[PDB]
Amino acid sequence: GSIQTLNLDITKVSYENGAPMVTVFATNEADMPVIGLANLEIKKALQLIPEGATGPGNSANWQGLGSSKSYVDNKNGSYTFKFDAFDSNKVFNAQLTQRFNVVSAAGKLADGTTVPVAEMVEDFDGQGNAPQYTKNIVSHEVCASCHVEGEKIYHQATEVETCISCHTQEFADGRGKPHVAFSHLIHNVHNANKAWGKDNKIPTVAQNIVQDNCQVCHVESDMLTEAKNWSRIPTMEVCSSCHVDIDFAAGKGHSQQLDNSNCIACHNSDWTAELHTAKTTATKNLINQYGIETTSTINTETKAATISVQVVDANGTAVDLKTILPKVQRLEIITNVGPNNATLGYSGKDSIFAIKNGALDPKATINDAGKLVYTTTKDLKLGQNGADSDTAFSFVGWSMCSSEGKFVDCADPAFDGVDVTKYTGMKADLAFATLSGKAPSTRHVDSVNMTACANCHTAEFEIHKGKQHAGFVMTEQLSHTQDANGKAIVGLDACVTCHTPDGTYSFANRGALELKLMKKHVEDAYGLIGGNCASCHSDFNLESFKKKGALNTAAAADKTGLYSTPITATCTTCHTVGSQYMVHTKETLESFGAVVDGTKDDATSAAQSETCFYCHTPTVADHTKVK
Ligand code: HEC
Ligand code: HEC
Ligand code: HEC
Ligand code: HEC
Ligand code: HEC
Ligand code: HEC
Ligand code: HEC
Ligand code: HEC
Ligand code: HEC
Ligand code: HEC
Ligand SMILES: [Ca+2]
Ligand SMILES: [Ca+2]
Ligand SMILES: [Ca+2]
Ligand SMILES: [Ca+2]
């Protein structure tokens, strides 16, 4: 017995006896009543002091009325709370909005049914009817974009409304610590201008992901009537969380301000909203001005691929590349072979900067039809490694010079791409060709897609933008399949051009795509993701292992490549052999048909000999599952 989702509703609030009696109804995912909850609580009872009541320009704030763990299980899915010590401070005012924060701890019913954590708030007037006014600015869903839903965010709770219900102005005032008010703390912990906590943690990682982008948490909503407070209610307490060098009292960094009375007079909502979103809005507009449509064909005689790039405008109308060449900062074409198991490795792949700072490479031309045309020079070894090796796949990344939200001429032929304020990564593309002229093979894209990446990195993520690459913006341009609802899947299959089974530039980096994303995020995003496979995966495509060969897993002493059988390679990214993270010894893994950091030939020969999935039945919900 296990409940998937515990739903909680406050269905009745009665003040007929003085302190409120609060009834909560608990249901599961099938809307069935949940009887026997042992850890249900009113974590906070609050009332809302309205905007400006504590002084001109000041925020609304949640005044404390107490808490209760005293309830009766009514044996029908409902639970009725009483307060032993309601409103200890004697501040209860029936003219104010009343809030209850209800939490149910993860654990078990008597029958031993597992129950997950649940949290909610609901607001009422002072007689238990619907409320007359609210402070509804954000909703828990925005935090779940980046923080694993149902797990504690830092401490105490899993949903932002619970945080807000404890980290009040009254709480911060009572501790003599303005910074622990939630409206200060939330921006402070994602912004690197000052450290937080006893340890002076500098939020470097949070700053690099959030980038002060208000729209990752402040989202327009009909369900949130105070959503525009982020631009409409400027206060020194909140604005100082990132603007840490102003002293309003002393007029240092700013004209003196002794209260919040005049902030809105100068800091109008339009200006605050525009200035903090201007750069991301401008970049997004630049990215959406142009597209590319890419084709590739194989010469049946020479077995070279010819890649043709059509620039298009926002409407999909042809643009002759000659008209914008002076503003093309880079265009790169990377070609590999065998989309399900790349065969050329990193050193064998075909690659070219066809354009650099307005200059065509001599190997690339613009034809009379205004398309860029480039022919591979590397041996593509088409057809030399089974049916999959009939297909060449070419990834096109490009960038355009830009300044303050406008495209500009690339004025410097040697511009090295380090200063990312001087150009924009544009929409990348993927083109398939076959030697045989049959339909191309394509990689599966049904287990991970760019929608997952975009939850943390935004849809405008210019991947690898800098000295080495133009910046790859991943969109429906390189979609070749739809999901069961007919939505275009934006896959990471193009990334395999470089993220090959042989790795990237070094054999030591687990460069294979099957290893690299999981390696990077277990090392650098563990605080957000940990073991949460669902942060990237809708599914595991375990059938894909039947199309894989050896995967590079290490470098030998002499810098040559060591390889594992593919399931072992994939699991050992996190579960390092010989470490505290892997019970199976090397000898045991070999007993299950694996090659562990051996030769490419031994790993290739054994690649379909692994018995792992006889015992292991991993799902995204539980990757650890065994018979
Ligand atoms: C992605 C765009 C994010 C959204 C939306 C939110 N958070 Fe976040 N948070 C994010 C990162 C990358 C980090 C740094 C993690 C690290 O390992 O350093 C954080 C950090 C926090 C913290 C600090 C605790 C810590 O883990 O360092 C807290 C308390 C926090 N975040 C809370 C939080 C809440 C309540 C959000 C919804 C309003 C929220 N975050 C959104 C990335 C993102
Ligand atoms: C009371 C019931 C709490 C709830 C719910 C949450 N937090 Fe909390 N938090 C609480 C206390 C008593 C303290 C210590 C404050 C102090 O005096 O120093 C904290 C501290 C934090 C901090 C550290 C803040 C800083 O040092 O600048 C963070 C980052 C924090 N809390 C985050 C947080 C989040 C995201 C919550 C919802 C998931 C949350 N807290 C709930 C008490 C309470
Ligand atoms: C999530 C990580 C956030 C980002 C990024 C930004 N804000 Fe935010 N803000 C967030 C929360 C959870 C809250 C508390 C809401 C509540 O119900 O208490 C806020 C609050 C503000 C406020 C206070 C509004 C008020 O009524 O006093 C302002 C003025 C505010 N936020 C502004 C703001 C701006 C300008 C940001 C981009 C630079 C921004 N926020 C980012 C969560 C997050
Ligand atoms: C961190 C999440 C921030 C919060 C909260 C606030 N601001 Fe901010 N502000 C932030 C950044 C990263 C920048 C630079 C923006 C850019 O792209 O140029 C700003 C800038 C300002 C400015 C203009 C710069 C100046 O020198 O005046 C103003 C006037 C400004 N911010 C005001 C402001 C107000 C009134 C806030 C509370 C509502 C506020 N900011 C919060 C980051 C963050
Ligand atoms: C008009 C007379 C003002 C009043 C009243 C307040 N502020 Fe202000 N502020 C004003 C200007 C002209 C600027 C510089 C704008 C620019 O783009 O250069 C500012 C700047 C800020 C900033 C940003 C500081 C920085 O980035 O260096 C913040 C965070 C800020 N102001 C907040 C603020 C608050 C909270 C106020 C009421 C207490 C307030 N300001 C009053 C003009 C005026
Ligand atoms: C939030 C839970 C994340 C999801 C989902 C994905 N990524 Fe991520 N990524 C995340 C963090 C916290 C970091 C480290 C940031 C730091 O400052 O250290 C990363 C790092 C990357 C990098 C490195 C480049 C960078 O811009 O920092 C890349 C290239 C990257 N991530 C790509 C990426 C892709 C393609 C994803 C979908 C498979 C993906 N990430 C998911 C947080 C999160
Ligand atoms: C060749 C032109 C490449 C293409 C196309 C892509 N990547 Fe890459 N990536 C490349 C190298 C040479 C390296 C460094 C060596 C290494 O293997 O680590 C990388 C690195 C990454 C990383 C690690 C963090 C980082 O350095 O940014 C990640 C998470 C990564 N690459 C992801 C990735 C994705 C999602 C791609 C398709 C959108 C992609 N890369 C393409 C070389 C090349
Ligand atoms: C985003 C940062 C990821 C997280 C978190 C996890 N995985 Fe992953 N995984 C990711 C990518 C980009 C790929 C490559 C897809 C490709 O086309 O090669 C993978 C691949 C796997 C595979 C191979 C089978 C497949 O579905 O493609 C397995 C078995 C796999 N990943 C397992 C796995 C587990 C168990 C995770 C949680 C502990 C996990 N992944 C997280 C990106 C990310
Ligand atoms: C990093 C993205 C991971 C990859 C890739 C895989 N696993 Fe994993 N696994 C991971 C974590 C963070 C944890 C929790 C560790 C803990 O605290 O216990 C796990 C756990 C397991 C377990 C249960 C633990 C045990 O001692 O057996 C199993 C059985 C397990 N993982 C299996 C497994 C398999 C078969 C994988 C390849 C398909 C695999 N994991 C990849 C993180 C990651
Ligand atoms: C049945 C006879 C098994 C075969 C065949 C393989 N594994 Fe296994 N594995 C098995 C058990 C009972 C456990 C422990 C489960 C638990 O919850 O404790 C495991 C564990 C792993 C783990 C997790 C390791 C850790 O966290 O310490 C991984 C990554 C793992 N196994 C991988 C794996 C691979 C790659 C195999 C084929 C070569 C393989 N296992 C075979 C049972 C069995
Ligand atoms: Ca209700
Ligand atoms: Ca909830
Ligand atoms: Ca900070
Ligand atoms: Ca295309």
Author numbering: 44 to 670
Provide the publication's sentences verbatim.
For these proteins, a defining feature is close-packed c-type hemes often in van der Waals contact and arranged as approximately linear chains that span the tertiary structure. Shewanella MtrC has evolved to support anaerobic respiration, specifically to deliver electrons from intracellular respiratory chain enzymes to extracellular terminal electron acceptors such as mineral oxides of Fe(III) and Mn(IV) and humic substances. In the native state, MtrC contains 10 optically indistinguishable His/His-ligated hemes.
For this study, we aimed to introduce a spectrally distinct heme within the MtrC heme chain noting that His/Met hemes in their Fe(II) states have a broader, red-shifted Soret band than their His/His-ligated counterparts. Thus, we introduced to MtrC a methionine in place of the distal His561 ligand of Heme 8, Fig. 1A, blue. We were unable to prepare diffracting crystals of Ru-MtrC Met8 or Y657C H561M MtrC. However, diffracting crystals of H561M MtrC could be obtained under similar conditions as for wild-type MtrC, and the structure, resolved to 1.60 Å, confirmed Met561 as the distal ligand of Heme 8 with a Fe-S(Met) distance of 2.3 Å, SI Appendix, Fig. S2. Superposition of the wild-type and mutant protein structures revealed no major global structural differences, with a total main chain rmsd of 0.3 Å as calculated using SUPERPOSE. The rmsd of both main chain and sidechain atoms within 6 Å of hemes 8, 9, and 10 (minus the distal ligand of heme 8) was also calculated, yielding values of 0.2 Å and 0.4 Å, respectively, indicating no significant localized changes surrounding these hemes. A high-potential center (Em +199 ± 16 mV versus standard hydrogen electrode [SHE], error is SEM) was revealed for Ru-MtrC Met8 for which there was no counterpart in Ru-MtrC His8. Introducing a spectrally unique His/Met ligated heme at a site distant from a Ru-photosensitizer has allowed unambiguous detection of intramolecular ET within the MtrC heme chain. The values, summarized in Table 3, describe ET between Hemes 10 ↔ 9 and Hemes 9 ↔ 8 with closest edge–edge distances of 3.7 and 4.3 Å, respectively.
